Amino acid sequence: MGPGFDFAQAIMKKNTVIARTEKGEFTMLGVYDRVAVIPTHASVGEIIYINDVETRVLDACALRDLTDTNLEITIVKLDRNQKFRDIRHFLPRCEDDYNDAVLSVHTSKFPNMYIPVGQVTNYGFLNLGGTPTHRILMYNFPTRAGQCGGVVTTTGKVIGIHVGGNGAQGFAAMLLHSYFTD
């Protein structure tokens, strides 16, 4: 509808895949080469389904901060025959608050879904499903089962992936440029 949705659509159309694990179907953001991200609660194993293709996982790392606190981001390298468009220059360098964000989802359940979530707070600490978690972004939207892995963007920045909610608010794990240095 506007330039917010334009940037979100551009990311969804080239940098997402449908990832299926034993814990369900997730939106999965491809960042560069064969490297993607997914919420750690997806429980990635040795084999994952990517757009319903059986795919070997070459490496998976559940990220934690230097306090050894969960970040709820898993970085996956896929044995895929094709690279992602490199979007690392759209990742923020530092923890921040944002205005006027979009949460975008693409699964079997929720195809081509875009949500204007409004103001994003640097919330910090969240007890997420009983797991102490850091670097949480918060937005005021009643997100649902099926939106985890959803991409949070502003015009020109990919800032997070959706990892939970409490019925009134939604929560995203920050993406930072420093996670994907090679």
152, β-bridge pairs: 103, 160
The answer to whether the beta carbons of residues 169 and 139 sit under 8 Å apart is: yes
94 catalytic per annotation: no
- Annotated catalytic residue, options 25, 41, 134, 162: 41
- Annotated catalytic residue, options 25, 72, 106, 134: 72
116, β-bridge pairs: 102
Question: In the chain, what are the helix, strand and coil shares in percent, each to the nearest 5?
Answer: 15, 55, 35
Q: How far is CA 59 from CA 82, 100, 147, 161, in A?
A: 16, 34, 24, 20
95 catalytic per annotation: no
31: exposed, middle or buried (Cβ count in 10 Å: 0-12, 13-18, 19+): buried
41 catalytic per annotation: yes
- Annotated catalytic residue, options 25, 106, 148, 162: 148
Residues forming the active site: 41, 72, 148
